[PDB]
């Protein structure tokens, strides 16, 4: 069907199984002193994390104070200059002998592809943390400073009123 | 190879986010009538803590199951209103998820 | 919107679940 069937073990665990789970896990721990499914109550025991700390799904694999970059910068600049130079040479190829133009085209793309690699090491979450950091920091400083400004102006008004009433005495 | 129970339970949890899946599951009588399914739903609650929460793909179902948790004391009735209510309350629920995680 | 791009949706894809190994796992639930 369109919707896959519920998992099979879901139907094994009734309320009686839930209430008898404590004694079952106590007995299992006492006896113990891929997990084989010898009893229907085994699944409620929390599954163990794989030792390799890896998870595979759909053909793809998955697994501290914030809780020479100049070399990369100059590499990027020289790569951009070389990319412009190669673009000029490739368009010249198109001009004179376009029949073999593709011979350079993908080459240029490789440099562009390398640029993407040069982005990968530069990857930005810390920079986003920084920018959010300063925006809420400056917002709270603005709120604070307007608080002492308003309380100070109220106090100044109170002192002026006190002087006015003392003069009228 | 045969996938482990981790993979199937995680995929079930992430598929619970679909409104069509929830509507289909609640359409059948014996799914809600059987206490086994709700027992499994309450068993699934323990994935809201790390490091299990680091392995999720769509955080919305995190509330949905919790919303489904509410369904055990709110009633089936309300199945018809489920798509409308999720569409209407998507903004504030996304905001509260962001507050729970992004802050 | 009209171009169905793979592996990037807001909600879990129905085709992703169909192609996921959970489908055959449910089919091979007897073998489990």
């Amino acid at each position: 069907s369109l919707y896959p069937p519920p998992p099979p073990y879901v139907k094994f665990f009734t309320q009686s199984n839930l209430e008898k789970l404590p004694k079952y896990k106590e007995k299992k721990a006492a006896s113990a002193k891929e997990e084989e499914i010898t009893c229907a109550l085994d699944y409620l025991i929390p599954p163990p994390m794989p030792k390799n700390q890896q998870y595979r799904a759909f053909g793809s694999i998955w697994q501290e104070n914030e809780s020479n970059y100049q070399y990369k910068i100059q590499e990027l600049r020289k790569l951009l200059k070389s990319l412009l130079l190669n673009y000029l040479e490739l368009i010249g190829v198109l001009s004179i002998n376009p029949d073999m133009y593709e011979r350079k085209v993908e080459n240029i793309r490789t440099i562009l592809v390398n640029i993407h690699h040069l982005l990968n090491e530069y990857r930005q979450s810390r920079e986003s943390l920084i920018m959010l950091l300063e925006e809420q920091l400056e917002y709270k400083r603005g709120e604070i400073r307007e608080i002492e400004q308003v309380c100070k102006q109220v106090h100044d008004k109170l002192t002026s009123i006190q002087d006015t009433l003392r003069t009228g005495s | 190879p045969l996938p482990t129970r981790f993979e199937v339970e995680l995929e079930f949890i992430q598929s619970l986010a679909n409104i069509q899946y929830v509507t289909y599951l609640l359409t059948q009588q014996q799914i809600w009538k059987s206490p086994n399914f709700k027992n499994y739903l309450k068993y699934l609650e323990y994935w809201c803590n790390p490091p299990y929460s680091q392995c999720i793909v769509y955080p919305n179902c995190l509330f949905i199951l919790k919303l489904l948790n509410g369904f055990m004391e709110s009633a089936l009735e309300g199945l018809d209103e489920l798509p409308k209510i999720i569409q209407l309350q998507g903004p504030q629920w996304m905001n509260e998820m962001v507050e729970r995680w992004a802050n | 919107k009209g171009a169905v791009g793979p592996n990037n949706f807001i909600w879990p894809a129905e085709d992703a679940l169909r192609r996921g190994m959970l489908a055959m796992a449910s089919l091979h639930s007897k073998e489990l």
Partner: peptide
Amino acid sequence: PSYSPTSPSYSPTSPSYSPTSPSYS
């Protein structure tokens, strides 16, 4: 003429009961 028209009694909240099954290829 027409004494009174009918009040709109639409029920979009109705979930419908369309059976879906031939999705697998």
